[model samples]
Target: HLKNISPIDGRYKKACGELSAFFSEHALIKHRIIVEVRWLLFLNEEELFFEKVTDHSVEVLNQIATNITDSDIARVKAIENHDVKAVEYFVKEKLKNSKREDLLKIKEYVHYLCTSEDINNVAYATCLKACLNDVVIPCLEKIMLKLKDLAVEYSHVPLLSRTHGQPASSTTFGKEMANFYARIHHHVGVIRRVKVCAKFNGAVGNFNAHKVASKDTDWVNTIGLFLKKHFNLTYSIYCTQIQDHDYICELCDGLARANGTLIDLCVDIWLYISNNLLKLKSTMPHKVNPIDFENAEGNLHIANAFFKLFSSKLPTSRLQRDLSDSTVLRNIGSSLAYCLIAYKSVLKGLNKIDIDRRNLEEELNQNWSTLAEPIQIVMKRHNYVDAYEELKQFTRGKVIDQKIMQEFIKTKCAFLPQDVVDQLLELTPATYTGYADYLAKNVERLS
Candidate 1:
């Protein structure tokens, strides 16, 4: 019956299994059962007027729900075409079979005062939170740790830096890798900070039925506090039949930013490997291909495609709420799967690089003009008029001789403690990376 199966299951089955525990059909059914059971227990423990259920009765009800099995799920699915309704039947059947006829009258309380989105939004948020904890964070942490290792290992190794397809300056291989690690670490904090809000108000967020059922109860406070305590979720203050998906939009935006960082890392590393700025080693000497570039490009494409699709489709709920989200929400796993793939690929790419000292030195020796950043900074510190313009005129779109730079330092440059100026003159683009390794170490700690 499935016509267009995604690579998450079709090609990348193992990765999908690790990730699918959040957004798969089985996961969805499980979450639905959880929400249904918890809400029923919440009502019973509070002794809502319908049946005035006892505390011991709540314990038995929770046990039945907590021990739901694969066979029990299938049995419910067999009798009820609707998934949430199936949960209702399962709960009622458990109560009836256990000779708890006293609780059977309260079966109507299963999904009381809610729409499908009321169940769905909370379930989806729970799924996202779990995936972030289980799959996403650990994968990102591994990548960050590997990059930090590179940053320290290759801290002093320098290579040519490019701007607009021309040599602009020199930077170390480790320094460039350090930038990627730092950027991703900051975005991970942001990703974890975004709160996924869920709603349980009612069909149209008014709690019309719950109010009629029990007038004196603070039902809103009760449900909100319950969700916050049990699920670590925030409740949406207002929603239609569907919760306002601004939180989902926020999550997508955060993920997109993280994906963009990985994509940038892939493209840069691919170029570095191609130019021989980094020497990639292979266990088998006969394997003569740019495997790093190949994997980097593939993973970047996968991650960006998922990010683009998830961000584009998740924001538009059809006129309050609709079945559109029911399908769209299911694909959240695809987005996380692609992110994991890209992260693992970057780690693989990092594993192969062997820095070339000869190539790095040759590049630095050929482009002595790259020291213009330091010269420009010194001139600005001493209030030199037209400092950047002077450097631009002298160094822009042109190469400078090493002797000419030394002569300029001796005669034309005016920021003379002369000893300090001489030290500046001796610095090259490779050694000028100020505290990049220190910063990378701190970023690693944060992750």
Candidate 2:
């Protein structure tokens, strides 16, 4: 394991091993065998030029589809020396060993009327669908639920807001967390809606051989419905020998956008840790660091880099096909591994930190100048002339404390009615979070 070059297999193997079932070479080989077997089964179901495939024969094919092993594929690859061809040979060998005379008779139809891409595209699509639904979405849902818990836990804790590194209006800590929660929740839906498409037409998208061999049968409708019904994938009616890979690009783009949003959350949390709004446990006095957020940020960016490259490069190929996307597609697991690492790191960081209530309240109480906007708005509502300029001159470039703010409002805004003045007089930085608590508490309702 130490000899492994990538951390996903070496350093972080335990964290990323669950992904191996979808992206490993063995997994690809298994998927290829499944597609080949499914195609043969589909042909038999059409009842054209052959007797009905026996129930035992169907069971044998299903066995190969579900229980293929690395040794089985390796035995075929030793002779074929090609990945897809190895899968075809493996299926034949399985049928030859079954000793069922009826099953052995249909060996020629194993990969009949199909090109390598016909099986390869469906295999890849099936793998991508499993990885997204089984691994990626479940990990993201855990992160989203963690964020929601934090948002409700700190819904009423007001913290000082900084715009351009200067004190501005105040907001609840929960509202900030809710902002990321809502963003990630929306993008998760974007990724879920992306369809993995497959093309089953023969070489050059014409079904040339399929049409010639079975002139009476409607191969188009037959293959199209077969792919849809069995694999839950969209059957592309028009494509070259290989799929165009636009759907892969769309999926990568959506994943990269989600990574970008997570990067933003990491940066914000790092800032909060730096400002002492969140506390970490320390063995040495005054020596705590936000290392988990930093780690999450680095890994998320690394994952995004790969996602961007896949989005930009996978869509363009020479003429109808090329080998460039083949090698690139193999790295999809690495990208998702990095994403999983970052998600776990963020969860670890969130679990370790607690909101520093004293720090948040003290900072908010210190920055009484945050109330200037509300006072100015109240002045404008009562038609006070130059309300903006009056508050600007009173609070600008100065640390306005509670006493100074109250004295200025009492003296300068004497023209306003007593009721409005009383309302403005009671405003404080802690109390100036307008609708922030409500927004944080009901984020799911709004979504």
Candidate 3:
């Protein structure tokens, strides 16, 4: 695909194309036309000082608006090179070609009392809603469900837990995965709560042209109702020439947070694969080479790079407005594409891993220090005031072999019952994972 040129158009063409109907240049132009045509229909149906167009006329207008084709978009882009104006012209041309004389007279009224931002903001917000619902959310849900599946399937498979790059305790692999799933589920709620704000308050956002043209009609209520009913957006009451885009900033920030969690997951998986705590298998024996390492390295780098740029860039703008967002908004697709790639890689790495019992047992035997939690808890049950400190002294930085353990049991902690001490002695690091499997089962039940 790169045999052509632009990275968005060629290298990541499928992602770009998938998102294009909502974020591409042509999509923007189509949205502009839709806004213009729909606004005109709104006015005519409500009898708001425009020509008294009828229900049939409105239907024809809707048909014309819906009939916009790819070639039509290209043709409109050809003349004068202004996308919005082309939409205006296209609607007017449609009106001219229609059979109704009254509707024909109302052609010039299509974009009345409107600024470019009026159409641009509404269209962009509409596209944002569509893209979030259609593309981004579904992709995230796929990965989240995959994590949930693995967490349930591996709920009882315990492994050594590391802290500060050193073995510290034992935990089930399921619990580790469940942590990520819970975090992302909470963040997905944050993303869904983000409101997409739009505005249609005319040139300087005050209904200046609207008041001058129509004294009998309430343009504010009319425009607000149109936007609310048609596009499912919240309209800004007061503004300058454009919507201030504070909500867009909130959306970008939420997405960045989600990406940050995924990045953490990627790094942890990479470390696990490197340590042989996990493995990546391949069906093609000849091609079975370093899949986990390559996936982790590539996806983590791509996700962080794109997420950092998106978080930093979307909030800025020139004094009232600027061309900066025009270029920057196009890259939303790229940022989300990186996220999708990272998610896929994590899922792939998870699928190939087969738990090794020998390795698991070796890790557990070496990390006998993990039994400290159970010991401390038992001491607390007997109401020992110095329970935590005593365990810390015995376990922290001291290698307690079976011989040392028996000596300590015989001399130092002789007050504790022999049966209780035997139970603690029998516990291995792998089976010491407390309530981890129980919680993993809960994830499946609730989900």
Candidate 4:
């Protein structure tokens, strides 16, 4: 285990092991076998001048697709000396063992009229669908739900807001968490709806060989229906040898945007820990570092970089085809692994830290100058001309406490009505949060 080069396989293997079933070589071979067998059966169902594939043969083929092992693929690959051809041989061997004579007759049709890309593209598309829906989105949803719970839990816990590294206004901690929750939710929706597209056309995406062999069959509509029925994937009617990878790039961009948002959350949480607004329950006497958040930040940065690279690089090809996208496509699991690790880290960080309410209140009370915004707004509403400059001169570069702020409101704005003065007097850093609680509570209601 320690011999592995990447931490996703080494130190963090348990966190990312599920991804192996979607991106590993064995999985790829198994999916290729599935596509090959399914195509053969589809051809039989179309009645293309052969006996219909018997029900028993169909069952045996399904069993082979479900149960093919790494060793079986490896043995065939040794003889075939190529991955797709190895899968072709594997399917042929499985069909040879079938009890039904009709199934054996159908063996010739295994991977019939298909180039390597036809099988490869469908396999990749199916694998990506499983990986995104079954693995990545679930992990992200867990993180989003955790943040949502935190947002509701701390809906009214007010804290001073930092803008440009300075206290500018006031907001609740829940509002900040809700902002990230909504952002991640939007990106997750985009990723979930992204069509996992595949092409079943022959070499160069045209049915040249099929038309030459049988001049009358509607191969386009037939294969389109086959892809939809068998794999639940959208059919890409126009493509080269490969399925043009644009959908993959779209998915990568969505993932990268979500990871970027997560990185922002990690950094802000780290800052809060640094500011003593959130305290870690640490055993060490002098060190209480935000290591979980830092870990999350580092992993997310790595994941985002990979996602960005995939988005920019996977869509381009050399004229009609190239091997570049093949190598890049294999790294999809690594990118999602880093994302999973970072999500767990963020959860760990969120669980370990408790909001330092006393610290938050103390900081907010100390930064009473933040109320200058409300006072200036009220002054402007009352038709005072230089309200902004007056507040700036009174509060800027000075430690304006409650006594000082109240004194300035009463003395400098004496012309304002007593009710307006009372409003100014009642304003505090803890209470200046504008609709933050409502926004935090309504995150689930957003479209």
Error of 2 at 12 (Å): 1.5
Off by over 4 Å in 4: 77-81, 281-286, 392-399
lDDT of each: 0.73, 0.85, 0.74, 0.86
TM, every model: 0.84, 0.96, 0.89, 0.95
lDDT of 4 at 229: 88
Q: Write the per-residue lDDT of candidate 1 for residues 305-351, one digit (tens) a residue.
A: 76677677766777766667666666677777777766676677778
Identify the superior model by TM-score, candidate 1 or candidate 3: 3
Model 3: per-residue Cα lDDT over 1-447, one tens digit each: 658765556765654367778877788888888899888887777777665677788888888778889977876687531657777888888788896887778998878878887888898899888888888777778768877877888889888889998877677888788888888887788999988889998877788888878877677787779888878788778777777777777777777777778767877876776676776664775444446536645755665676566567655666666767666666666666665555555666667766666776677777766666676676677666787677667656767755555455456555678787677667767778888888875774553
Q: Which 10-residue window in model 2 sums to the lowest lDDT?
A: 72-81
Worst 10 residues of 3 by lDDT: 285-294
lDDT of 1: 0.73
- Say which prediction, candidate 2 or candidate 3, comes out ahead on TM-score: 2
How would you order the candidates by lDDT, starting with the best?
Answer: 4, 2, 3, 1
lDDT (Cα, 0-100) at 39 in candidate 2: 85
Better of 1 and 4 by TM-score: 4
Candidate order by TM-score, decreasing, is 2, 4, 3, 1
Error (Å) of candidate 4 at residue 277 is 0.3
Residue-level error in angstroms, candidate 4, position 59: 1.9
Clashes of 1: 0
How close is each model in CA RMSD to the real structure? 4.1, 1.8, 3.2, 1.9
